[PDB]
Amino acid sequence: KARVYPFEDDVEVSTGDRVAPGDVLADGGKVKSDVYGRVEVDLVRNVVRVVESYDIDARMGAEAIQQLLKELDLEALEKELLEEMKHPSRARRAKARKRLEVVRAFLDSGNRPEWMILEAVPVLPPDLRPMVQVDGGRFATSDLNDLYRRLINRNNRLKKLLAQGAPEIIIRNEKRMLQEAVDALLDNGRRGAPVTNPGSDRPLRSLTDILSGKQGRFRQNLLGKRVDYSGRSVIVVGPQLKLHQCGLPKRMALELFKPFLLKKMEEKGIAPNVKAARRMLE
Amino acid sequence: QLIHKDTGLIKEDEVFLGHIPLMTEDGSFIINGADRVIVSQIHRSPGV
Amino acid sequence: DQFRVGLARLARGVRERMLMGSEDSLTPAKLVNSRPLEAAIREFFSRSQ
Amino acid sequence: GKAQFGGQRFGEMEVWALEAYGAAHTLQEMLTLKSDDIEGRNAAYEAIIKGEDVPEPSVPESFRVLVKELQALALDVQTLDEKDNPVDIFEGLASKR
Amino acid sequence: KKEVRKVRIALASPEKIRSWSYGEVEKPETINYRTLKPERDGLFDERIFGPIKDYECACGKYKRQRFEGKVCERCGVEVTKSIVRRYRMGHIELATPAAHIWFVKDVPSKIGTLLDLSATELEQVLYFSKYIVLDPKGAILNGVPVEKRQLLTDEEYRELRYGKQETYP
Amino acid sequence: EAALRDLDEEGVVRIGAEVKPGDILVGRTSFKGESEPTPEERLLRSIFG
Amino acid sequence: KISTSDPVRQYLHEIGQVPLLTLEEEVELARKVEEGMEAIKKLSEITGLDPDLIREVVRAKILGSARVRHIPGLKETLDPKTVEEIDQKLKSLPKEHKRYLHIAREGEAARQHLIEANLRLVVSIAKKYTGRGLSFLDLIQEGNQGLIRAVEKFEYKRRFKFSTYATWWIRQAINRAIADQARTIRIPVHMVETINKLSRTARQLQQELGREPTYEEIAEAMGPGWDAKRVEETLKIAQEPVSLETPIGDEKDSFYGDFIPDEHLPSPVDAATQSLLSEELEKALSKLSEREAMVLKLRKGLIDGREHTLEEVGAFFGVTRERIRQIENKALRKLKYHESRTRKLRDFL
Ligand SMILES: [Zn+2]
């Protein structure tokens, strides 16, 4: 489906452009083409095939979506949906409000929809996802790095490809994969689940996972901390004790107050300085 | 015993690659120096 | 039963050998490997519930 | 450690109990100084050593850490005051450039 | 020296994001194994996250606390408590935009629940992988001129890009 | 040295010894801070050999 | 269907691909590419502009506009402005030259086709490089790029099948990336070689030897420069490694990490000690030879390298090493023994 436009005398454009009818085409202007499409260059009969393909923009993935978010005035839709609020008594009025509150929150508490999309992926400080040596020549880490890795890999690969003006397919496809890696990191399992490529097909503890440790319904979460001046032992009854008192193994007591104690020591001839008492009790 | 279509009956009568634990005179086991025990567990007998 | 798993896990191994196995350069234990079964049982006891 | 003891698992159940009484500080220091607030403890120790009073509780790594996790999840978490003005919990090592 | 009274939670401006990053990870490289070294421009490139040794650069050209916070004109690593390594954040710059799932698999899928898009059908279909929607313009048609933004398929897409062709052996 | 009274058997402590929390069942030595002596410590150390 | 979590199949619609690349076709396309580049060369030259630059252009246009990188690395190339500028230029060039244009044009377009048509050849290969340790996908895509290269680097002029040709490149890009991204830790290739080389042998040994041969055995077995403890270090180095998030024997709520302690940071004890240390130190320091007490400290105590005498001479920007020796002496000496009175740092060691 293309319009054969044979030419002769003057020249045209370059086999790939969108034309409909464009300012000029060929032969010193003796040629234009009210009809749309993209240029194809024949070099024999100085003829030109112009398949019709007006320039439309239909992108995939985020980019696309992202655009939309930007290209959107809330102040608008706001009062817009506001006009479905009661008018269609019960049917379309339901959805309306639903969709509407969102906005209000966005609209109100200053933010920007576009934000929900990504191109700037944060990274935890190292010592929070450390890499440490352990046993006779081996170390350990957090899955993140891994997650993180694969991700980077993908993105950088991607770059080249574009830099390679490659078939938008593999490209798209690539992006596709990338996106995956993306979420894969944020919250693993929310769609298909990746595991240590090798060994235990156990999933990798992702952000969310790690976070709320939701893989337990945040009902059994590992809630609790360890105290410093704590201690434990078995109990016995002290008939001697007076209500507000309680027996305490010196030995145990000792540790719990070491510092204070130390000080006192020093505070008394018996102990010249600190490290003294310190070792002095070791 | 591995044979061949040519009735090639070559029989390497040996393969001790794997060894398995033994049960003590009393009935327990020695795993990596640790006295280990195995608990006989129950289930739903196979039938209709 | 545990003996069987790593056992069956060896046959899997041995069957993957008929593929690139020579006419008769396969006979004995060139088709062999305990590790899989070795682990199974080993893994078993040692790390059994 | 081996020749060194561990700390008591202070949990919600105990938090709850404490709360009930109203010993704000304790619960704080309890979880901060006595546990997750780094700089604190040392400063704490020393203080005690010199026979001094106790400094105040900052943010528990647990939480800071948390913030990061969030951020790592592409999520700004902002500590603010009355005037609704952001506050750095990392006091610097967060502010860049 | 003072106290707080209000905590906030807002999305992150890529700007804000970038407003945090003490650098950008460009390299996967974890640590060099021969010496266990935070691979340069890698995930531990302390040039980004900081000294691994409080108050001290890489090449060591700088050490003592007597260099408060003076960057290295060589290893390009600052001088301060290595502790900051568990606090500073770096980023990655995405060649292409990627969606934050928590606004998709969470229903209403905020974003879609914001574009009259099927919290799945619509949203998913497109973004994730296979199908495309008409971004801004669509004059050409198949009977129906355009969809300000409605969905469309590949063959659909191409049957417009390449118009219509056919090979005959 | 009084802390070596019993663990004198060229590395190990001599059998049949009344040990108490804190004594040395066995003597071991390695290298810390990636075997880098503190400059702070440096000085101190020099002052006594 | 829904959570049709099988990118695989999708990409696998490569059957919708028309691999109908008969020899005659492949051929044709081939030359059409080389020529396309040769052209670019003329161009750049016949223009004084960079070649890569050119083709970069040639692409975009052929690559349609619905594909233009909204962020050409964020403004690198003015995708919407500096672009046409070139076009009208080239277009505004004589036929003889301008002809080369549509050549490269077709040239690139042709390329595209060629690529795709063999995207399956790709896959048919990745299959063999499975398990080695990398997402089939990643595998595919990598071989995919190795392919493109193969394309680039390819002289059709020498009559012979592309399949069999490129097939090579693919492999490389693959292994290439395998050695690269495989591990959690960056390690040399030659490293890899040997590593596998090892493991492999292990079998050929364990089997025969009936037992698990060790260093010695293998070190020997291995070859030219193989020491037991060498072997040793390798294995150690060839390890996976380990997750901190690994659940512990508790099998309930314990994780490796819950046990790894920190040593880089001083316990309030030490912290205090050092601060406490830093104290009396200078306490003594001050009441002493001003510039000469500071000397040693000013050197390593402030930066690095105390007693760099042959330096500290000009580091004092004056006196010679000869005298330095002396100073130290009395300095330290005079101190300690004086501090034998006022006992402070005496409680350290
Ligand atoms: Zn430096």
Side-chain angles (χ1 to χ4, degrees):
Chain A
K1 172 43 183 168
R3 286 295 176 183
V4 46
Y5 279 106
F7 82 76
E8 346 169 310
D9 301 327
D10 287 296
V11 72
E12 224 151 52
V13 299
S14 56
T15 188
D17 340 292
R18 41 200 168 186
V19 282
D23 291 297
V24 296
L25 183 54
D27 292 42
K30 296 180 178 179
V31 189
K32 184 186 206 200
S33 187
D34 18 329
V35 179
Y36 309 62
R38 280 53 175 289
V39 188
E40 295 302 300
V41 75
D42 147 59
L43 299 205
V44 301
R45 186 189 171 179
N46 312 178
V47 175
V48 304
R49 313 106 174 188
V50 180
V51 187
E52 302 82 342
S53 180
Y54 135 68
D55 254 74
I56 58 162
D57 180 49
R59 304 154 177 172
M60 270 194 239
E63 165 183 53
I65 309 315
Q66 187 193 60
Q67 292 303 158
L68 325 184
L69 298 180
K70 319 177 183 179
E71 307 148 58
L72 203 49
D73 195 307
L74 333 174
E75 300 276 43
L77 206 110
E78 154 202 299
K79 304 181 182 181
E80 182 193 303
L81 299 190
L82 218 45
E83 296 299 294
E84 293 194 310
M85 171 208 76
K86 183 189 172 188
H87 314 63
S89 277
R90 298 190 154 201
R92 307 173 75 192
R93 153 173 174 183
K95 157 207 175 185
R97 55 180 139 190
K98 311 310 166 180
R99 194 172 187 180
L100 188 50
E101 168 52 65
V102 178
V103 193
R104 209 56 170 298
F106 247 126
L107 257 180
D108 199 302
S109 294
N111 276 298
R112 247 194 179 67
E114 317 71 25
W115 298 166
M116 300 183 271
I117 206 60
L118 295 165
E119 71 190 9
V121 187
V123 182
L124 173 83
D127 291 340
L128 297 180
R129 64 191 195 304
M131 174 71 91
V132 168
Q133 178 134 54
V134 303
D135 180 63
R138 206 175 181 184
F139 337 73
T141 22
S142 185
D143 308 308
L144 311 187
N145 300 321
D146 251 42
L147 293 156
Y148 269 126
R149 311 212 299 82
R150 28 162 304 104
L151 170 60
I152 300 192
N153 286 153
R154 306 188 158 219
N155 200 44
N156 314 318
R157 188 192 324 178
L158 169 56
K159 306 169 145 192
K160 317 184 177 185
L161 310 155
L162 304 179
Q164 210 62 300
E168 73 65 53
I169 153 192
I170 51 201
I171 300 289
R172 168 53 230 171
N173 140 59
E174 179 50 29
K175 302 169 195 143
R176 176 180 307 175
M177 320 174 50
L178 170 67
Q179 160 49 346
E180 192 156 57
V182 175
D183 323 318
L185 179 74
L186 294 175
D187 178 46
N188 191 19
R190 259 288 207 178
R191 187 168 179 291
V195 302
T196 59
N197 196 304
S200 65
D201 50 310
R202 85 171 180 299
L204 296 200
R205 281 285 276 173
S206 117
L207 289 163
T208 332
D209 310 30
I210 292 157
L211 172 59
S212 53
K214 189 62 179 172
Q215 58 174 183
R217 190 178 286 279
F218 213 142
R219 70 156 205 187
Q220 45 184 53
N221 228 283
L222 359 163
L223 303 173
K225 286 189 176 184
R226 304 208 157 302
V227 170
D228 250 308
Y229 301 62
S230 54
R232 173 210 314 177
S233 181
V234 171
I235 62 188
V236 191
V237 53
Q240 296 314 65
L241 314 177
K242 290 195 164 185
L243 177 44
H244 63 89
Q245 310 175 310
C246 65
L248 179 39
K250 305 187 163 185
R251 203 67 77 178
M252 175 184 234
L254 177 81
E255 176 53 17
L256 299 172
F257 298 45
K258 160 218 174 182
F260 296 62
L261 173 55
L262 294 166
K263 184 61 173 66
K264 287 296 181 187
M265 297 192 242
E266 187 196 67
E267 285 177 38
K268 289 190 155 191
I270 56 183
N273 88 293
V274 177
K275 178 66 181 298
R278 281 278 200 57
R279 299 180 288 185
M280 152 59 84
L281 317 187
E282 67 175 67
Chain B
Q1 175 179 293
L2 163 58
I3 301 175
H4 308 299
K5 182 181 185 178
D6 42 293
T7 66
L9 333 172
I10 313 169
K11 60 185 191 72
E12 173 222 53
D13 304 296
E14 285 301 59
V15 276
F16 83 98
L17 343 196
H19 8 63
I20 67 170
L22 315 176
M23 192 172 54
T24 318
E25 183 158 59
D26 74 303
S28 55
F29 291 65
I30 297 169
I31 313 314
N32 307 300
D35 273 309
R36 205 81 178 182
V37 177
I38 285 309
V39 197
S40 41
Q41 65 126 43
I42 61 171
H43 68 81
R44 176 194 206 177
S45 71
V48 180
Chain C
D1 47 69
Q2 193 48 39
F3 173 19
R4 316 180 201 187
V5 298
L7 200 55
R9 291 168 200 161
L10 169 57
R12 313 180 191 310
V14 71
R15 290 174 176 178
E16 305 161 53
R17 317 211 192 201
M18 175 189 193
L19 315 181
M20 68 291 195
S22 290
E23 289 178 293
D24 304 302
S25 173
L26 145 150
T27 312
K30 306 205 69 183
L31 316 170
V32 182
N33 179 43
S34 58
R35 296 194 181 187
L37 179 55
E38 196 64 53
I41 288 169
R42 160 177 181 170
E43 308 310 343
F44 167 34
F45 290 61
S46 41
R47 284 65 66 168
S48 178
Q49 171 183 172
Chain D
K2 276 186 179 180
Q4 201 62 67
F5 274 126
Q8 293 297 123
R9 209 212 163 176
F10 199 94
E12 61 190 312
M13 289 236 251
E14 293 53 43
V15 177
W16 296 348
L18 266 189
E19 304 190 323
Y21 284 91
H25 293 284
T26 327
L27 191 51
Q28 181 159 53
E29 63 137 65
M30 176 48 58
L31 305 183
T32 45
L33 319 186
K34 296 187 153 184
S35 182
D36 218 28
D37 160 40
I38 310 176
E39 188 169 67
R41 53 192 169 200
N42 319 276
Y45 185 58
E46 224 150 305
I48 319 176
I49 297 300
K50 327 270 185 174
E52 294 179 51
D53 201 332
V54 184
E56 281 305 280
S58 68
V59 172
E61 291 315 305
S62 80
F63 168 96
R64 308 186 159 203
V65 165
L66 170 46
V67 188
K68 288 307 167 189
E69 294 180 290
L70 304 165
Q71 315 215 304
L73 274 155
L75 303 164
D76 163 64
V77 213
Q78 205 53 101
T79 34
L80 320 183
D81 51 66
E82 325 69 15
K83 289 277 190 175
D84 302 298
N85 291 301
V87 206
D88 187 351
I89 51 182
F90 312 99
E91 65 213 317
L93 315 193
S95 310
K96 84 163 184 182
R97 286 186 181 177
Chain E
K1 179 181 176 180
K2 53 220 61 189
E3 59 155 62
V4 69
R5 272 174 174 170
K6 299 179 177 60
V7 176
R8 169 183 208 152
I9 179 178
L11 321 190
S13 296
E15 307 50 270
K16 198 165 194 172
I17 304 184
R18 306 203 184 71
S19 85
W20 306 336
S21 68
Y22 278 69
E24 155 182 47
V25 177
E26 308 168 57
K27 336 304 179 184
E29 282 56 58
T30 45
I31 270 184
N32 130 271
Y33 79 94
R34 77 176 187 281
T35 344
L36 329 182
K37 303 307 185 178
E39 217 67 80
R40 280 291 315 305
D41 280 310
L43 277 172
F44 293 72
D45 184 51
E46 67 189 303
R47 301 185 308 155
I48 306 186
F49 321 87
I52 293 186
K53 292 183 182 178
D54 307 285
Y55 299 90
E56 237 175 61
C57 69
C59 29
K61 309 310 172 185
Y62 297 77
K63 294 153 181 174
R64 184 57 178 186
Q65 172 178 51
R66 302 318 163 189
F67 302 74
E68 50 206 314
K70 295 296 163 294
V71 184
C72 183
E73 302 120 51
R74 171 154 156 163
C75 57
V77 177
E78 181 190 307
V79 284
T80 27
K81 311 85 168 185
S82 59
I83 184 181
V84 57
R85 209 151 181 292
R86 76 179 338 232
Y87 297 148
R88 284 178 185 187
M89 296 199 84
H91 75 293
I92 293 181
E93 210 72 61
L94 297 206
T96 296
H100 190 315
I101 202 160
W102 285 25
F103 308 84
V104 198
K105 303 314 171 177
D106 178 306
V107 200
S109 176
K110 305 300 96 71
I111 56 191
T113 304
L114 192 56
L115 293 185
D116 196 318
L117 289 181
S118 161
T120 49
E121 301 306 292
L122 305 190
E123 304 183 282
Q124 163 86 236
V125 153
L126 165 141
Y127 176 31
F128 260 91
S129 155
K130 61 207 194 173
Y131 301 141
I132 18 183
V133 292
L134 0 182
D135 262 307
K137 303 172 179 177
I140 211 167
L141 54 55
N142 76 295
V144 173
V146 70
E147 323 177 321
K148 67 174 187 173
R149 53 172 164 166
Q150 283 197 297
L151 178 66
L152 152 136
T153 193
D154 194 304
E155 44 286 88
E156 274 171 52
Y157 189 63
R158 304 188 178 188
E159 204 207 65
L160 318 192
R161 298 299 281 185
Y162 274 77
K164 296 194 173 186
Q165 306 179 300
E166 278 268 305
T167 165
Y168 300 79
Chain F
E1 139 52 51
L4 314 161
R5 290 293 188 179
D6 306 292
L7 172 84
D8 156 61
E9 286 183 2
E10 294 79 285
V12 191
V13 55
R14 70 92 198 183
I15 295 189
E18 163 75 319
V19 337
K20 295 183 183 176
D23 304 314
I24 304 182
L25 312 184
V26 185
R28 183 178 71 174
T29 50
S30 44
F31 334 81
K32 196 210 174 188
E34 208 176 311
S35 51
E36 301 156 56
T38 305
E40 298 274 2
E41 169 208 308
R42 207 164 180 64
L43 149 70
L44 172 277
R45 285 300 192 77
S46 40
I47 319 164
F48 304 71
Chain G
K1 296 184 178 185
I2 288 189
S3 59
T4 192
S5 201
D6 62 70
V8 300
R9 297 183 166 58
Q10 317 190 103
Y11 191 69
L12 278 180
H13 66 279
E14 312 303 58
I15 185 163
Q17 285 276 292
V18 178
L20 192 65
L21 297 209
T22 295
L23 190 60
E24 317 178 59
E25 285 174 54
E26 292 189 305
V27 177
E28 160 210 8
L29 206 55
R31 64 164 184 277
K32 304 195 166 185
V33 181
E34 284 198 35
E35 301 161 52
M37 163 228 55
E38 267 145 47
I40 302 175
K41 304 192 177 179
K42 268 286 188 180
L43 316 174
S44 62
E45 142 232 346
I46 317 172
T47 325
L49 314 194
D50 310 308
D52 64 296
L53 188 63
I54 289 183
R55 56 193 191 67
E56 165 67 16
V57 170
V58 185
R59 293 188 182 175
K61 288 296 178 181
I62 307 177
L63 305 179
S65 177
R67 176 184 168 62
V68 296
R69 41 187 180 176
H70 216 41
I71 54 175
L74 288 180
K75 282 185 181 182
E76 221 181 71
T77 330
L78 283 187
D79 300 308
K81 314 185 177 189
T82 292
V83 288
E84 292 68 59
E85 302 188 50
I86 312 312
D87 303 289
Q88 288 61 81
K89 291 187 173 186
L90 328 180
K91 299 192 177 187
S92 69
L93 303 182
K95 289 181 176 181
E96 320 77 58
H97 310 309
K98 192 180 179 179
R99 65 167 181 165
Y100 293 114
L101 171 28
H102 313 96
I103 299 187
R105 272 288 192 171
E106 284 273 321
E108 184 54 66
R111 163 167 145 179
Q112 297 300 297
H113 300 308
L114 192 31
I115 299 174
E116 298 107 48
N118 302 277
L119 290 182
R120 188 172 175 184
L121 193 303
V122 170
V123 183
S124 64
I125 298 179
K127 299 192 172 184
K128 273 58 178 185
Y129 292 65
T130 295
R132 279 203 186 182
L134 206 36
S135 174
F136 196 68
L137 311 174
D138 302 317
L139 318 195
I140 315 148
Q141 287 299 70
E142 288 314 80
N144 279 302
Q145 27 160 53
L147 152 50
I148 306 174
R149 173 67 163 200
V151 185
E152 173 186 5
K153 301 304 184 298
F154 175 69
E155 19 211 49
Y156 79 94
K157 303 174 171 177
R158 300 184 178 183
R159 192 75 158 184
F160 44 66
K161 188 181 197 185
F162 194 59
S163 160
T164 53
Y165 179 86
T167 302
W168 183 66
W169 291 89
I170 297 180
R171 282 197 166 185
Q172 330 312 174
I174 296 178
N175 301 288
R176 163 62 179 184
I178 291 182
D180 303 2
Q181 306 169 65
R183 208 172 206 302
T184 256
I185 302 305
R186 177 60 165 198
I187 179 178
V189 182
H190 71 68
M191 282 279 84
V192 192
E193 307 177 34
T194 52
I195 296 150
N196 321 306
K197 168 184 183 63
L198 321 193
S199 43
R200 313 173 185 179
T201 311
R203 312 152 195 161
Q204 316 175 63
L205 314 192
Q206 189 287 298
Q207 56 172 47
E208 167 92 73
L209 185 58
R211 75 183 54 182
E212 287 290 26
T214 157
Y215 305 165
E216 316 60 56
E217 291 82 322
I218 162 55
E220 303 162 290
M222 204 40 97
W226 302 83
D227 189 307
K229 51 61 177 163
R230 161 173 193 176
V231 184
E232 191 148 44
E233 303 320 304
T234 314
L235 351 170
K236 306 187 171 185
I237 303 183
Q239 259 135 75
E240 287 63 273
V242 164
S243 163
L244 325 173
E245 314 93 306
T246 296
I248 305 313
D250 200 322
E251 314 160 307
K252 303 174 186 178
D253 55 359
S254 49
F255 315 85
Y256 204 138
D258 306 330
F259 321 90
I260 293 126
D262 165 297
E263 50 255 284
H264 178 76
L265 305 183
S267 82
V269 161
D270 345 325
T273 305
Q274 300 130 60
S275 84
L276 166 53
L277 174 68
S278 316
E279 299 172 47
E280 283 68 275
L281 296 174
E282 51 148 41
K283 275 190 178 174
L285 146 67
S286 62
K287 278 77 198 325
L288 181 61
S289 319
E290 182 167 53
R291 281 292 194 181
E292 301 183 306
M294 310 158 58
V295 297
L296 315 177
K297 78 174 189 179
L298 293 167
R299 195 42 210 149
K300 84 173 180 308
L302 296 196
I303 310 179
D304 212 80
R306 147 287 208 72
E307 233 200 301
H308 280 189
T309 316
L310 278 167
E311 309 190 334
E312 313 188 309
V313 296
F316 204 65
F317 314 88
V319 185
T320 299
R321 62 167 173 183
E322 185 285 296
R323 185 175 175 185
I324 292 185
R325 165 277 207 301
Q326 313 178 58
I327 307 177
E328 186 161 58
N329 307 178
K330 280 300 183 171
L332 332 179
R333 299 175 186 174
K334 280 298 174 190
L335 168 52
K336 48 96 172 192
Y337 245 50
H338 142 220
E339 279 303 272
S340 294
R341 312 309 83 183
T342 307
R343 289 311 188 178
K344 298 178 181 178
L345 326 76
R346 192 41 178 154
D347 327 299
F348 187 83
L349 314 181

